[PDB]
Structures are given as structure tokens and as C-alpha cells.
């Protein structure tokens, strides 16, 4: 409960800030468009935290950001959460920690939500189409 962070307001080059959360970003550099099915795009979402998470071996060390590996299908807006890593610096960098079991799931995105904005942006620029 105790710890308290000031997430950067200035945005690191290549990070795309999303609607509805000024601390949630797409790491533009991490984007991989699948060779076999170009509608499928892999990317990291990166969240700068408001409150430190004590997820490290040593209980005084806390994370400042989270990096999450996503896979997006631009044809049906399915978004799979693949893995989560915690970092002790902002922008998903620095000393890393992670859960033993990674909890995975796929959603079908819905309008007016943070990750839907991500998909509109990614698909518009990397899915390369005009048009769900």
C-alpha cells in the first residue's frame, strides 16, 4: 500500500500512448507482423505504474513498469495476452521479475476501451487496411 510513483509525462520515442490511460503504451519498436498471416501482429504493451509492486526476491525492491506481450488479430480483433514481466524502471526496462505461471487469455475487443484503441492504431498502420 505504501509506495508512490510519478509516471513520466514525457513519452519515450517509439511509445504510443493510448486513450483512457496516459500511462499505457504500445512499444512501437516491439511490433512484429506475422509473415504467414499479415493480419496477425505481435507487440508489447508497456504500463508505467502509479504504485510500486513488490514482486522481487528482495521485499524492498518494487517494479515501476510492466511489459506485456500481446498478439492481435486485426481481422476479428482477438487479442491474446501471452506473458507479463515486471521491471524496476519505467518503460519496461531494467531489473526484471516474472510470475512462475503465466496466465494467458484471448479476448474479443470491444469499442471504447484502452486496448481497442491500441488495435485501431496498430491495424491502421501495420494491418494496412481500410474498413472489426
Amino acid at each position: 500500500n505504501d509506495m508512490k510513483l510519478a509516471p513520466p509525462t514525457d513519452v519515450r520515442s517509439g511509445y504510443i500512448r493510448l486513450v483512457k490511460n496516459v500511462n499505457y503504451y504500445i512499444d512501437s519498436e516491439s511490433i512484429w507482423v506475422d509473415n504467414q498471416e499479415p493480419q496477425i501482429v505481435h507487440f508489447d504493451a508497456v504500463v508505467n505504474l502509479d504504485k510500486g509492486l513488490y514482486v522481487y526476491p528482495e521485499p524492498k525492491r518494487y517494479a515501476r513498469s510492466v511489459r506485456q506481450y500481446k498478439i492481435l488479430n486485426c481481422a476479428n480483433y482477438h487479442l491474446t495476452q501471452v506473458r507479463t514481466d515486471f521491471y524496476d524502471e519505467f518503460w519496461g526496462q531494467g531489473l526484471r521479475a516474472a510470475p512462475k505461471k503465466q496466465k494467458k487469455h484471448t479476448l474479443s475487443l470491444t469499442p471504447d476501451t484502452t486496448l481497442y484503441n491500441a488495435a485501431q492504431i496498430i491495424c491502421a498502420n501495420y494491418g494496412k487496411a481500410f474498413s472489426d
Side-chain angles (χ1 to χ4, degrees), residues 1-131:
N1 47 293
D2 211 292
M3 201 45 192
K4 23 66 188 178
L5 311 174
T9 319
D10 292 341
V11 184
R12 172 84 56 89
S13 128
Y15 287 75
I16 305 180
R17 174 182 275 148
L18 300 185
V19 160
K20 289 194 179 211
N21 185 349
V22 300
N23 297 311
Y24 196 113
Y25 304 83
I26 294 161
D27 167 4
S28 200
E29 188 282 344
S30 79
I31 292 174
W32 182 64
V33 174
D34 190 275
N35 52 290
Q36 190 76 352
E37 177 37 72
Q39 280 290 59
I40 288 183
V41 186
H42 299 212
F43 69 97
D44 293 344
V46 169
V47 182
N48 291 336
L49 297 172
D50 264 315
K51 189 186 178 295
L53 297 181
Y54 296 81
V55 282
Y56 285 84
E58 219 221 6
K60 82 190 174 184
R61 198 155 209 161
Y62 54 92
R64 294 183 190 217
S65 67
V66 192
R67 183 171 282 278
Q68 291 184 309
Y69 193 122
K70 306 291 198 190
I71 299 169
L72 171 72
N73 189 357
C74 291
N76 56 16
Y77 274 41
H78 289 181
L79 187 68
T80 307
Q81 165 61 28
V82 170
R83 80 171 282 118
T84 296
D85 289 288
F86 302 101
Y87 291 89
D88 82 336
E89 292 152 27
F90 294 113
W91 306 117
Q93 312 284 340
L95 183 71
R96 183 187 72 76
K100 288 154 286 193
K101 200 141 173 182
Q102 291 282 345
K103 271 296 126 77
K104 301 160 191 312
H105 57 81
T106 295
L107 313 112
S108 183
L109 293 173
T110 184
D112 202 32
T113 73
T114 299
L115 280 174
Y116 185 96
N117 182 234
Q120 302 253 265
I121 294 176
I122 282 160
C123 297
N125 291 265
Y126 298 82
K128 279 255 60 161
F130 316 93
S131 44

